[model samples]
Every structure is written in C-alpha cells, then in structure tokens.
Target chain A: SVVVQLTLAFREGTINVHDVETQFNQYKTEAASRYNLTISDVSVSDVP
Target chain B: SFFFLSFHISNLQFNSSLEDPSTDYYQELQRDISEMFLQIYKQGGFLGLSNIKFRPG
Candidate 1:
C-alpha cells in the first residue's frame, strides 16, 4: 500500500493538536472519497 | 517554531494514468492536500504557512 505523508511546521504553541487532528480527519475522509480511494489509516502527530 | 503537524495517509491507491508523481494529476492531488492543511491552519489561528513537504512511504 502507498502512503502519503505531509509534514507542516507551525509557530510554537499557536494551536491545539487535538482540534487540528479532528479537522484533518474530517477533510481527509471527504477527500479520499472524492478521489475514489479508501483511507486505511489517518494519523496526526505533533512534533517538539 | 517548535510545533509541527504530520499527516499520514495509508492504503492510498492512484489511478493508472496518474501514478507518476511528476504528472499534473499528482500535482493537483498535492495541491489539494496543501489546501486542506491551509484551511486547518487558518481555522487554528495560524498567521501564515511557511512550508509544506510531501514524502512517499
């Protein structure tokens, strides 16, 4: 299976990871469907 | 400067005509993903986005 990973850098302490993760998943789900693909897993992580 | 968000999408399948990463189709897909994150950033109060990197796994 192929996986596409996107790493984004943001200003420190500017946003909440939990909220971002939730929003990402919602958009990702719709995108996957629109592209005729199924998402097996979605993960969002914060880097220190 | 210390915060980062990594988004992983697994089990992805691409169309036969769009498998190449250099093709316009693939670029469009990448743009779409970028926009997705941009929206998130806007909603989360991020002033601006500096960079975005895509990797294959």
Candidate 2:
C-alpha cells in the first residue's frame, strides 16, 4: 500500500472545522469510489 | 503562523490507465490532480497529498 501524507495550512479564523471535516469526508468517499483507496490517520494542529 | 492539518492516505489501487505511472495519461492525471488539490486546499482545507509511492507486492 502506498501512503500519501498531506498537510494543509490555512489562515486563522478561516479554518472552519466543520467545513474541513465535510471536505475530507467528501474526499474519502470519492477516493473510495473512484480510486479504491482509503484515507486514514487524520490529525490537525496549529503552526508553532 | 500556519494552521495545518495532516492526513495519511493508504491502500491506493491502480487500474486501467493508471496501472502504469510512467505513461503520459498517468502523468497528466497526476499533474492535473495536484493542481486541483492545491486549488481546493486554498478554498478549503482538504486532501492535498504531498507524498505517493508504488509497491511491488
């Protein structure tokens, strides 16, 4: 299995947790349907 | 300074036109998808994968 690590950096106050979760869900669904892949090990953090 | 979210994606399956990562079609798909990912990331923190690989088994 190939692993893809993705990091997203967003602006303050612009980071809507709900929107981001929805977006990732959509990505996960589409990826499974279109590419037969799975998105896992999700985590979020702010820059130091 | 940056609000960042990281994710790990696995179990990638290759099929048809994507079976070979060396073809122009595969290359185009990779390029196009990267662009789209960046665009979406700008709009919303979404799946913009920065790493990928191929396996023999």
Candidate 3:
C-alpha cells in the first residue's frame, strides 16, 4: 500500500474541511480510473 | 496563503510494482496526483498547492 501526504497553502478563512474532503474524493475516483491504483482512505486537516 | 492545510492518503494499492521513483510508472503516478491536487486547490478556493509527497509501505 502507498501513502501520500499533501501540504496545501491557502488564504485564511477561504476554505472548509468538508469541501476539501469532497474534492479529494472526486480526485481519488478520477485517479483510480487513470492509474493502476486504488485509494482506500483519506483524511484532511486544517491548521493555523 | 497564510493558512496551512494538509491531508494524508493511505492504503493505496497499486496494480504494478512501483518501488523506484526513477521508474516511468512511479513518475506518471506522481504527476497525476500532483495535477489533481492543483485542480482541487483551484476549485476549493485556495491560492495554490506548494508540494506533494508520497511514500510506499
């Protein structure tokens, strides 16, 4: 199994966790189709 | 771009062997993931994506 860690920088008060998770899932689904891999789990965190 | 956001993706099972980063297979997979992150950043109302890191276990 593979593990990926993504660090994203954004402006304060511009995003939410729920939306990020949604987009991630969307990306995961698309990625699964294009690559020979499957994403089994994902977790997002917002830090100040 | 003052706020910091991060995510972790685990339990990724690949159909082919990709133990070497220098290999084409690993490079392609990395590129695909990077592009998707860029898209997510833009669509999610963020400024940009700085970097992406991957590890196989």
Candidate 4:
C-alpha cells in the first residue's frame, strides 16, 4: 500500500538535475496527496 | 536502514533478493509489474526517460 518514490535524473549537468528534481517533486507531492503519506524526502540524484 | 518489497538499503547502498520464492502468486505479481514498468520505459526513447526514474531503492 506504501511506496518509495525516488527521482534520479540521468541527464547532463545541473540544469537537467534541478529540472528533473523539481518535476519529480511535483510527482511525489501529488502521490503523497493521493496515498496520504508524508514523503519526508524524495531523493534527487544524477548518479546511479 | 530501510526496506522495500524486495530491496534494502543502508548507508546509501542497495541490495535485493535474487530469488524470492515466497509464493507463486507474489512472484507472478513481480513478473507482471516488472514488465508493465519496463513497457513504459521501452517506449520512452521518444519521450525521454520519465522525470521519475524507477529503480530499486
């Protein structure tokens, strides 16, 4: 019923990192609202 | 320390079960979902990977 949602940006540089992080955070926020889970931190990274 | 369905993490390292034979039903579910998940990414070449990269955490 619960899930761990992490966002990894594999694109180049800070530009894509920040962009993907922002976009994925929105995705996380929407999911939190849907599932009633407080997402402490949806981690952001470019590394595997 | 944290754990997901078949994944565990500590100090930011990842680990998983190579063979989870807990149940045929569960294994079927994993196989089904794995393909469902991959199906999207397989078509993602045109769209670029989703903002969210689905990986074991």
What does candidate 2's lDDT look like per residue over A1-48, in tens digits? 333333455645565655665676667776666655576655555447
DockQ numbers for every candidate?
0.41, 0.41, 0.46, 0.18
Interface RMSD of candidate 2, in Å, is 5.1
Worst 10 residues of 3 chain B by lDDT: B1-10
How well does chain B match by TM-score in each candidate? 0.49, 0.48, 0.51, 0.37
**How good is model 2 by TM-score?**
0.46
Candidate 3 clashing pairs?
Answer: none
lDDT tens digits by residue: candidate 3, B1-57: 333334334445544546566778777767877777675567444666644555654
Q: What's the C-alpha lDDT at position B43 in model 4? A: 22
The i-RMS of candidate 1 is 3.9
State the DockQ, from 0 to 1, for candidate 2: 0.41
Residue-wise lDDT of candidate 1 within B1-57, one digit each (tens)?
334455445655446534566777677767776675565466344654434444554
Cα lDDT, model 2, residue B31: 67
- True lDDT of residue B14, candidate 1: 42
lDDT tens digits, residue span B1-57, model 4: 111111111222222332233556444434543433343233222223222212343
Clashes (candidate 3): 0
Q: Which candidate leads the pack in TM-score?
A: 3
Q: List, residue by residue over B1-57, the lDDT tens digit for candidate 2.
A: 243454444664544556577878567646654564574456542334543333322
lDDT of 2: 0.53
RMSD of 1: 4.1
Candidate 3, chain A: TM-score against the reference:
0.69
Docking quality (DockQ) of candidate 1: 0.41
Candidate with the larger TM-score of 1 and 4: 1
Q: Judged by DockQ cut-offs, is candidate 3 incorrect, acceptable, medium or high?
A: acceptable
Top candidate on lDDT is 3
